[PDB]
Each structure stands twice: as C-alpha cells, then as structure tokens.
C-alpha cells in the first residue's frame, strides 16, 4: 500500500451507434496513508494538517481525521464518429495529476 | 450532522504572553451524496465519475471525502516584543473531493 | 504586561471549554 500517492484507474467507453476516440478513458486516483512524521515524496504538509496531527497525538479523538486527496486536474478531448457526422468535445478537470493529504 | 460544511474548532495557546489567546481554526465535516443537496459550488467531473462508479455496483478503495479548499493567514504577537505572520492557518471553505 | 495578566480573570463555568496547546 505505502504512503499517499497516485495510482491507475481506467474505464472503457462504448456507444451503440457512434465510435469514440480515445477508447480507454484514463482517470487516476489518490490512495495510501500519510502519518507523522512525514515519510513521503510530495511537498511538505501545511499548518492545518500538522495542527490536526498534533491534536490527534496528544490524546484527543477527531471526528474527521486527515485524508489523502488530489489537488490538481487536467482537461481532455474526445472525438465521436458516425455516418455523415464527426464531432469533438473538450471537457476540463478530468485527470488527476497530484496527491497530498488534507 | 447534515451535509459537508464548516464548523468551529478552537484551542488556547499558553507558553511571555501571547495575543490573541483563542486560536481559531475551523474544520470541514459532514457527508456529500448523489444527487447533490448542499450549498457549496457544484461538484467536478472526477467526483461525479467516482459516485457513478460507486452507484453502478463497484466498491472503491477510497470513496470521496469532505475536505477544505481554501486557507487564510494569521498574525501573532508575544510580549515579555515580537511579532510573527504565518500563512495557511484558518480554513474558510469546504467541498468534497 | 501586568495589566493584561490582571484583566484576564478566570472563568466561573463548571465545564472545560476547550483544550490548551503550547505554541511550539
């Protein structure tokens, strides 16, 4: 498992009439565990996260412990083919590209 | 409990004498579902994709979580005179990713 | 400093309001 990082997750898009390019739709996901002290490869934590971790270490019990989540995204473009018609679309914020727990 | 939103969480600083005393740092808490019943901005495409995967029948290893998305700085003063400024301390928005 | 310490009177509530953490 290891610490918080990025990992693969892909699906296949299918249509009954048209054909889509590209077929394999790729959208990674963030997964792992981040602890204290930090043993990771991403940038340093913020002040909020270290405050929460210290609170957890003193003996308290929070109702929402820190979670590993992404912090950036990139767009994508799709093309659809069918008789007498080709179409293209551009959709932003689809592919995750970084992870860091908040 | 309700849906994902912001809620109070404060501590007291004690060491000199510090101003201000009550250190305020809110926290995000709640649950976000499908369809959206919230007051924050609309979800992204990634989150709706994950929710649709979860609804179809699959079982993800990291379901969406309610987290903050903004921060503000703060300034502290210590008397015995010193001042410090530290950024990214107070959460001010919530939205699940 | 003395005035600030004097003005910060203790509370009279019967329950702890929150935790205390040193500015370290």
């Amino acid at each position: 498992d290891g610490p918080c990082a990025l990992r693969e997750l892909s699906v296949d898009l299918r249509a009954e009439r048209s054909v889509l390019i590209p077929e394999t739709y790729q959208a990674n996901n963030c997964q792992g565990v981040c602890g204290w002290p930090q043993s990771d490869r991403n940038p340093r934590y913020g002040n909020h996260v270290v405050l929460l971790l210290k609170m957890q270490a003193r003996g308290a019990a929070l109702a929402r412990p820190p979670c590993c989540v992404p912090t950036a995204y990139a767009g994508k473009l799709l093309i659809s083919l069918s008789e007498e018609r080709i179409s293209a679309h551009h959709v932003p914020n689809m592919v995750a590209t970084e992870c860091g727990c908040r | 409990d309700g849906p994902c939103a912001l809620r109070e969480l404060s501590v007291d600083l004690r060491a000199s004498v510090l101003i201000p005393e009550t250190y305020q740092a809110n926290n995000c808490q709640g649950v976000c579902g499908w369809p959206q019943s919230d007051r924050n901005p609309r979800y992204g495409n990634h989150v709706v994709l994950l929710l649709k995967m979860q609804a179809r029948g699959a079982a993800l290893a990291r379901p969406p979580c309610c987290v903050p998305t903004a921060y503000a700085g703060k300034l502290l003063i210590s008397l015995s005179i010193s001042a410090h400024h530290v950024p990214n301390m107070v959460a001010t928005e919530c939205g699940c990713r | 400093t003395r005035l600030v310490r004097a003005l910060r009177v203790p509370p009279a509530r019967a329950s702890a309001p929150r935790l205390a953490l040193d500015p370290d």
């Epitope: 609170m55 003996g59 308290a60 019990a61 929070l62 109702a63 929402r64 | 409990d1 809620r7 109070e8 969480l9 004690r14 926290n27 808490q29 | 203790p10 019967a14 329950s15 702890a16 929150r18 935790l19 205390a20």
Partner: antibody, heavy 120, light 107 residues
C-alpha cells in the same frame, strides 16, 4: 497514551477524615481541569467538584459544600481530595475523571475507583 | 438545577430486535448531552458525545438523536455482548447523570 492511577481501599472510624489521591501519567494536568465523582450502589452517580491546576480555582456542588476540599500539585502531576466529618453515609466508590466535549473533538478518561468504608 | 428523566426503567429483548430509550430534560439544554455505558464491575465509557457524533471504536449499530428538550438513543440489532446499564448526562450546568436503565436477554 494516558493513564489514571488511584490509591487502595480504606476503612475509617465514624468521625475521622480521609485523604484520597489521584495521579496522572503520560499527560500534563495543567492542560485541563480534573473532576471528582462519587458512586453509591443504588443511588446512581453524582458530582462533587472540579479543580483547575493552573490557577487553583476550584468549584464544588451545592450539596457537598463545606465537607470536601480539593487540592492539586503540578510538581508531580497529582491531585488530592480531603473528606471530613464522616457520618456512616459516605461508604461508596470514588472516581477521578477528565472530560472534554466539543463539536469536533472530545476526550474522556476515567480512573479505576477507590472504595471507602465507615464502620466501628 | 436541571433534572433529567430517563425512560423506560427496565427492558428486555430477544437478541434480534431494535431498542429505543428516551431521556427528557426539565429545561432547554441546547444540544449538550452524552450517552454512556457501564458494564458490571467496571468504570463507565463514553459512547456518544454532543448529540450525534461517535467516539472512536464505537460500531455502527449505536445511534442517537434529538434536540432542545428531547433526546433518544437507539440500537438497531442487539447482540449478546450488550448487557450493561446506560446513562444520559447533560453539561449545560452542574453535571447530572440521569437515573440509569438496565437490559436483559432471552433464551
């Protein structure tokens, strides 16, 4: 971690006074108050008082006023309770507690319990 | 002072049923209430603080709700390891610890 340790069972004459102790471990008592609780076999729980080690300001209930004195010492992280003027109605079990409840976090720690008996 | 009344005073289940307990207050107590559990020969242990949250290690079965002047505590599927006495506490003033409710099984 945090651990609360107490003394052993005590038996006293009807008219003497007792001094119970409660010592923390792995924690600094200056962080928050300390509460003393009483329990009788069938009358349910009750509240006696609380102490704030940092300042020394203590609060007692409206029924136990004048026959229970609470004190604290931060040099060794310990608290003492002196119980005076026993009348064969105090045979019970006493507990040392730390409580904090807030909308986003909470901390609850209890002792092991000290038994006090009064007989001749 | 605030006085808390807890009902019912006795209960009996069949190890597969749902259970509900109510704890009414004598004055507006906002949303400061806690639900405990005490097994024989042991010190209490917190289960539910505030009015809805859950302490670490508490399973999903237990739940609680209410506000203002009425609070309820419910268990969905009783098991064989839930024999204890339950108390409801308030914190808006000098603490009060309810009256206590027992529980029993069948066979």
């Amino acid at each position: 971690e945090v651990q609360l340790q107490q003394s052993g069972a005590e038996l006293v004459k009807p008219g003497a006074s007792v001094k119970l102790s409660c010592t923390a471990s792995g924690f600094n008592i200056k962080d928050t108050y300390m509460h003393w609780v009483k329990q009788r076999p069938e009358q349910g729980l009750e509240w006696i008082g609380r102490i704030d080690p940092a300042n020394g300001n203590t609060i007692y209930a409206s029924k136990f006023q004048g026959k229970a004195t609470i004190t604290a010492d931060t040099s060794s992280n310990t608290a003492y309770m002196q119980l005076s003027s026993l009348t064969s109605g105090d045979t019970a079990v006493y507990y040392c507690a730390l409580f904090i409840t807030t909308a986003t976090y909470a901390m609850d720690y209890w002792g092991q319990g000290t038994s006090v008996t009064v007989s001749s | 002072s605030i006085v808390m009344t807890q009902t019912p005073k006795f209960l009996l289940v069949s190890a597969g049923d749902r259970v509900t307990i109510t704890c009414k207050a004598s004055q507006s107590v906002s949303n400061d209430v806690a639900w405990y559990q005490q097994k024989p020969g042991q010190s209490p242990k917190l289960l539910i603080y505030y009015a809805s949250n859950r302490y670490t290690g508490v399973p999903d079965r237990f739940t609680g709700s209410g506000y203002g002047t009425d609070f309820t505590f419910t268990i969905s599927t009783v098991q064989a390891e839930d024999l204890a006495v339950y108390f409801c506490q308030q914190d808006y003033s000098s603490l009060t610890f309810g009256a206590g409710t027992k529980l029993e099984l069948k066979r």
